[PDB]
């Protein structure tokens, strides 16, 4: 549910910041940082 995905959006972002650091995820991150709840 939304709760898990809140953490998902956070942990995947950690993956991004360390390893998945392609500029294309930053798109999704710009959408992720925002309170999309």
Curated annotation (Swiss-Prot):
Residues 17-23 are extracellular. Found in jejunal circular smooth muscle cells (at protein level). Expressed in human atrial and ventricular cardiac muscle but not in adult skeletal muscle, brain, myometrium, liver, or spleen. Isoform 4 is expressed in brain. Changing residue 18 to A: 4.2-fold decrease of channel inhibition potency by the spider Jingzhaotoxin-I. Changing residue 24 to M: In BRGDA1; arrhythmogenicity revealed only at temperatures approaching the physiologic range. Ubiquitinated by NEDD4L; which promotes its endocytosis. Does not seem to be ubiquitinated by NEDD4 or WWP2. Regulated through phosphorylation by CaMK2D. Changing residue 8 to M: In BRGDA1; uncertain significance. It is found in: Cell membrane; Cytoplasm, Perinuclear region; Cell membrane, Sarcolemma, T-tubule; Cell junction. The chain crosses the membrane at residues 1-16, 24-37. Cannot form the same regulatory interactions with beta subunits as other Navs do. Interacts with the PDZ domain of the syntrophin SNTA1, SNTB1 and SNTB2. Interacts with NEDD4, NEDD4L, WWP2 and GPD1L. Interacts with CALM. Interacts with FGF13; the interaction is direct and FGF13 may regulate SNC5A density at membranes and function. May also interact with FGF12 and FGF14. Interacts with TMEM233. Interacts with the spider Jingzhaotoxin-I (AC P83974, AC B1P1B7, AC B1P1B8). Interacts with ANK3. Interacts with PKP2 (via N-terminus). Na(+) channels in mammalian cardiac membrane have functional properties quite distinct from Na(+) channels in nerve and skeletal muscle. Pore-forming subunit of Nav1.5, a voltage-gated sodium (Nav) channel that directly mediates the depolarizing phase of action potentials in excitable membranes. Navs, also called VGSCs (voltage-gated sodium channels) or VDSCs (voltage-dependent sodium channels), operate by switching between closed and open conformations depending on the voltage difference across the membrane. In the open conformation they allow Na(+) ions to selectively pass through the pore, along their electrochemical gradient. The sequence contains 4 internal repeats, each with 5 hydrophobic segments (S1, S2, S3, S5, S6) and one positively charged segment (S4). Segments S4 are probably the voltage-sensors and are characterized by a series of positively charged amino acids at every third position. The IQ domain mediates association with calmodulin. Belongs to the sodium channel (TC 1.A.1.10) family. Nav1.5/SCN5A subfamily. It is linked to Progressive familial heart block 1A: A cardiac bundle branch disorder characterized by progressive alteration of cardiac conduction through the His-Purkinje system, with a pattern of a right bundle-branch block and/or left anterior hemiblock occurring individually or together. It leads to complete atrio-ventricular block causing syncope and sudden death. Long QT syndrome 3: A heart disorder characterized by a prolonged QT interval on the ECG and polymorphic ventricular arrhythmias. They cause syncope and sudden death in response to exercise or emotional stress, and can present with a sentinel event of sudden cardiac death in infancy. This is Sodium channel protein type 5 subunit alpha. It comes from Homo sapiens (Human). The lineage of its organism: Eukaryota, Metazoa, Chordata, Craniata, Vertebrata.
């Amino acid at each position: 549910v939304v709760v898990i995905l809140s953490i998902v959006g956070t942990v995947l972002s950690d993956i991004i910041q360390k390893y998945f650091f392609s500029p294309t995820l930053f798109r999704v991150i710009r959408l992720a940082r925002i309170g999309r709840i």
